[PDB]
Amino acid sequence: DYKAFDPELWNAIDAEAERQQNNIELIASENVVSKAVMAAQGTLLTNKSAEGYPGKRYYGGTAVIDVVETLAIERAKKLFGAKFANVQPHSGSQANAAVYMSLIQPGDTVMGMDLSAGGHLTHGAPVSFSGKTYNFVSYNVDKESELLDYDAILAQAKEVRPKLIVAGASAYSRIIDFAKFREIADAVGAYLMVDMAHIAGLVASGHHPSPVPYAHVTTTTTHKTLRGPRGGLILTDDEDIAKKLNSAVFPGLQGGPLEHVIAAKAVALKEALDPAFKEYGENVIKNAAAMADVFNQHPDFRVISGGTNNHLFLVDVTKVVENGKVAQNVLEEVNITLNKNSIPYEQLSPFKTSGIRVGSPAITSRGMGEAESRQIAEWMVEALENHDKPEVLERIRGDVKVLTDAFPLY
Amino acid sequence: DYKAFDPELWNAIDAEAERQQNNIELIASENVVSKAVMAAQGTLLTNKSAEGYPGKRYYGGTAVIDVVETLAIERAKKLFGAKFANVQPHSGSQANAAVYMSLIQPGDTVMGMDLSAGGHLTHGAPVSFSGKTYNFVSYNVDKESELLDYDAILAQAKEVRPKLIVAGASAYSRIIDFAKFREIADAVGAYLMVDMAHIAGLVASGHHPSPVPYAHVTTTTTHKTLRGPRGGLILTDDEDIAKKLNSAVFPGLQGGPLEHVIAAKAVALKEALDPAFKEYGENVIKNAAAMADVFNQHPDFRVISGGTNNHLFLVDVTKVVENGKVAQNVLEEVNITLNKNSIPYEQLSPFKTSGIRVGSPAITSRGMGEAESRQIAEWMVEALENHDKPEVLERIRGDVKVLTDAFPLY
Ligand SMILES: *[C@H](N[C@H](CO)C(=O)O)c1c(COP(=O)(O)O)cnc(C)c1O
Numbered sequence: 106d107y108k109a110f111d112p113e114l115w116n117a118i119d120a121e122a123e124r125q126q127n128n129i130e131l132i133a134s135e136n137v138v139s140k141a142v143m144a145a146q147g148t149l150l151t152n153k154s155a156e157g158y159p160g161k162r163y164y165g166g167t168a169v170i171d172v173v174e175t176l177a178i179e180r181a182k183k184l185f186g187a188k189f190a191n192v193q194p195h196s197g198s199q200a201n202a203a204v205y206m207s208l209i210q211p212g213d214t215v216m217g218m219d220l221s222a223g224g225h226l227t228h229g230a231p232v233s234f235s236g237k238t239y240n241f242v243s244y245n246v247d248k249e250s251e252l253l254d255y256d257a258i259l260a261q262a263k264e265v266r267p268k269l270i271v272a273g274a275s276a277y278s279r280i281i282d283f284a285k286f287r288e289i290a291d292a293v294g295a296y297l298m299v300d301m302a303h304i305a306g307l308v309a310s311g312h313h314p315s316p317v318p319y320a321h322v323t324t325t326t327t328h329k330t331l332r333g334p335r336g337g338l339i340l341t342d343d344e345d346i347a348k349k350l351n352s353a354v355f356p357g358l359q360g361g362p363l364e365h366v367i368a369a370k371a372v373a374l375k376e377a378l379d380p381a382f383k384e385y386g387e388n389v390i391k392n393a394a395a396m397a398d399v400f401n402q403h404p405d406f407r408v409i410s411g412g413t414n415n416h417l418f419l420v421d422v423t424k425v426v427e428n429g430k431v432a433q434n435v436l437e438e439v440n441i442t443l444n445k446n447s448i449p450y451e452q453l454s455p456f457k458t459s460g461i462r463v464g465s466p467a468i469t470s471r472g473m474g475e476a477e478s479r480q481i482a483e484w485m486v487e488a489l490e491n492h493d494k495p496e497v498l499e500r501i502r503g504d505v506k507v508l509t510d511a512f513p514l515y
Numbered sequence: 516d517y518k519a520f521d522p523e524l525w526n527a528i529d530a531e532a533e534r535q536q537n538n539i540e541l542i543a544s545e546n547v548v549s550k551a552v553m554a555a556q557g558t559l560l561t562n563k564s565a566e567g568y569p570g571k572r573y574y575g576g577t578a579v580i581d582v583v584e585t586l587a588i589e590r591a592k593k594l595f596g597a598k599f600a601n602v603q604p605h606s607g608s609q610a611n612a613a614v615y616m617s618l619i620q621p622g623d624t625v626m627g628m629d630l631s632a633g634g635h636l637t638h639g640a641p642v643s644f645s646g647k648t649y650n651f652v653s654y655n656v657d658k659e660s661e662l663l664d665y666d667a668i669l670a671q672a673k674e675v676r677p678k679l680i681v682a683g684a685s686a687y688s689r690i691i692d693f694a695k696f697r698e699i700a701d702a703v704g705a706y707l708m709v710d711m712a713h714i715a716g717l718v719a720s721g722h723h724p725s726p727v728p729y730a731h732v733t734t735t736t737t738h739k740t741l742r743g744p745r746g747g748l749i750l751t752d753d754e755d756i757a758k759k760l761n762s763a764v765f766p767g768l769q770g771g772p773l774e775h776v777i778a779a780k781a782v783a784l785k786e787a788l789d790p791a792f793k794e795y796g797e798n799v800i801k802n803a804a805a806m807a808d809v810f811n812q813h814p815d816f817r818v819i820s821g822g823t824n825n826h827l828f829l830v831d832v833t834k835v836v837e838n839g840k841v842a843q844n845v846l847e848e849v850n851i852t853l854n855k856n857s858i859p860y861e862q863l864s865p866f867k868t869s870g871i872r873v874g875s876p877a878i879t880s881r882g883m884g885e886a887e888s889r890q891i892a893e894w895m896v897e898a899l900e901n902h903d904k905p906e907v908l909e910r911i912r913g914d915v916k917v918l919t920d921a922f923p924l925y
């Protein structure tokens with residue numbers, strides 16, 4: 106009935122709920138959060154300014170806010186096995202900024218994964234505060250295997266002499282060896298920071314090795330595979346680092362935290378501590394593998410590194426369509442959303458790319474299994490193969506509606 | 516019933532809803548958002564990654580997100596009379612960071628209001644990124660009048676030669692002359708940034724003259740007097756500056772925006788565009804004047820600057836209780852929340868202070884008027900006079916309960 110006061114706004118919110126229902130979401134970073142997560146960030150906790158930390162706030166009337174934030178901190182520590190957690194970062198990007206501010210100074214040398222191989226903007230892009238403030242040098246995957254080569258990264262680190270190595274990626278499909286990253290860091294006297302945003306849910310589910318025992322500091326989004334609200338999180342085992350991180354988040358970088366979003370983080374972290382989260386992770390892994398297998402067996406398509414051991418994979422589409430932007434646009438026509446993506450050693454424009462990135466988390470959260478995941482990948486191959494046949498795309502779009510009706514979003 | 520799964524979290528949220536109902540909220544930054552604002556940030560908009568700007572997103576299936584974000588932008592532009600708006604900043608601190616990144620360089624000199632006279636942490640505190648990155652040199656209020664002296668500030672600017680002047684405050688009761696601030700900036704070829712976070716509601720209601728025609732760039736929180744969700748907003752009339760601001764917010768400082776929060780910004784901005792919002796502003800002014808008048812007349816209390824023309828005022832409490840912190844602790848015992856606050860030329864430790872800060876927006880949103888405001892101020896005078904008479908406090912707590920039951924929070 107507040108809806109009656111603002112139809113243009115509430116019409117658009119209702120349309121987005123229906124678009125999410127009627128579309129197959131394969132964007133590897135996306136998920137479907139619980140009713141409980143959305144309800145928690147729709148609470149009157151937005152009415153309370155909580156500058157500072159539990160028991161050490163700028164203002165009064167914060168005793169109950171302190172219970173909520175302490176639940177989020179304790180559940181993070183328990184879930185990831187860390188001695189310290191900071192649940193205030195507004196975003197993964199703000200989490201990363203606080204860690205740089207805590208460990209290094211402006212102009213220090215940092216190594217981060219190449220943006221074409223899956224490094225984030227905040228891992229040294231020149232258009233990011235990261236690239237503008239610090240001296241980032243990128244490491245890549247091997248050109249032939251498309252795998253991290255820890256011997257090559259070591260040789261580069263001994264030349265570059267970084268103060269900090271950043272590990273973690275948004276387009277890398279294989280198991281990262283975090284013990285090797287920390288061995289590299291230790292060999293050159295560098296800090297190791299792991300941004301586990303993409304894989305945090307699989308770390309929580311037991312399906313990906315934890316960086317937490319190896320990274321001086323671990324950052325993540327609470328969204329993506331962890332299936333939480335949009336925000337950031339920082340972990341460490343080192344009490345002196347924890348004090349600097351806390352001061353860097355507030356008052357270094359942010360002011361008041363979003364305590365309604367932190368309530369939602371507490372909700373999501375308790376959902377990830379449930380035994381049912383292990384089964385989620387297992388279905389995320391099986392579902393992503395079942396899609397990759399369709400592309401591996403098709404002669405016209407190549408999966409980057411030959412497959413996946415996580416939630417995502419990339420496909421070189423350039424034997425079937427001109428570039429990944431074309432592939433993204435064709436699949437959108439049949440109500441399948443994914444993103445064009447640069448492949449390692451990408452030769453085409455970053456606006457076009459050679460690739461698509463596919464993820465399983467959102468379709469897994471809707472209850473889909475291996476048979477549905479395989480059928481979705483068969484529709485992708487068929488749509489790209491027949492991109493100039495409207496009657497084909499029309500039929501695939503109608504088949505997609507039967508599957509979305511069968512696996513309702515909420 | 517999702518709440519059965521997590522009673523510790525949902526019991527804490529019920530405990531905060533009761534705490535807010537049974538508390539008289541005088542923290543001058545606090546407010547009571549509409550059910551519509553909370554509902555918008557509890558939507559499945561949290562599921563969509565919207566890196567980029569409307570029509571220029573990193574990913575597809577963003578055409579409905581684009582309508583929502585464009586409503587927030589169009590409403591900010593219409594409400595404040597600005598040619599350009601950015602609704603993505605996660606916070607007021609993030610909005611300010613993007614403006615500095617757009618207009619100046621590290622090491623550049625900036626003038627901002629002294630932190631003791633109500634400058635924000637992000638206006639050059641040494642523990643903020645603001646003081647760490649830029650050379651902040653404060654202007655103060657007149658020691659006698661506790662007013663801004665535009666002649667004194669002009670002389671200081673001619674001597675310091677800042678690249679940027681920051682105006683706006685968290686603890687200043689009087690009308691800030693934005694036309695004079697622009698004259699001062701113009702005299703030295705500085706940019707003028709106004710942070711209107713505390714007064715944006717009064718600007719929107721017509722009760723404070725707008726900085727928007729005078730500042731090169733205006734920042735604000737969407738929360739505080741504007742009565743929106745927690746977040747930031749940037750306004751400018753200069754198209755070249757607007758492009759720099761857009762790049763600085765993303766990919767300069769942030770990654771994906773909180774589109775659920777942006778929907779709530781669009782909701783709050785439509786509310787502020789309503790004729791009822793003028794009546795809200797009217798009552799905020801009246802209620803604050805009413806409380807200020809009680810302290811003005813009582814002989815044991817001085818109001819800083821001797822009164823208010825906005826939503827807040829400060830009171831020197833040191834003749835009645837040892838320090839502002841003691842006053843905060845005592846009023847907490849009778850279910851009245853405000854904060855200890857430094858006064859101009861504060862002499863005591865920042866952890867104690869001589870002052871309390873009081874504002875009207877929250878009690879005004881609960882539907883209270885001049886009578887209840889006068890009454891609340893009488894209760895505050897009485898509790899502080901009788902601070903070690905346990906039975907006087909207990910009886911005030913009871914009178915407070917009658918008022919809170921009379922004006923239900925929701
Ligand atoms: C509000 N913050 C002050 C501390 O609450 C206050 O006294 O009211 C404020 C901001 C807040 O930015 P965040 O959203 O916390 O990052 C920024 N600018 C000004 C002038 C404020 O008053």
Ligand SMILES: *[C@H](N[C@H](CO)C(=O)O)c1c(COP(=O)(O)O)cnc(C)c1O
Nearest residue numbers: 134196197198225275300302564770771
């Ligand atoms: C998410 N990054 C990309 C877009 O979502 C992606 O390709 O998946 C991400 C972040 C995001 O931080 P924000 O909350 O948007 O600031 C940070 N770090 C990594 C590794 C990501 O994948």
Ligand SMILES: [Mg+2]
Nearest residue numbers: 155156163164
């Ligand atoms: Mg506080």
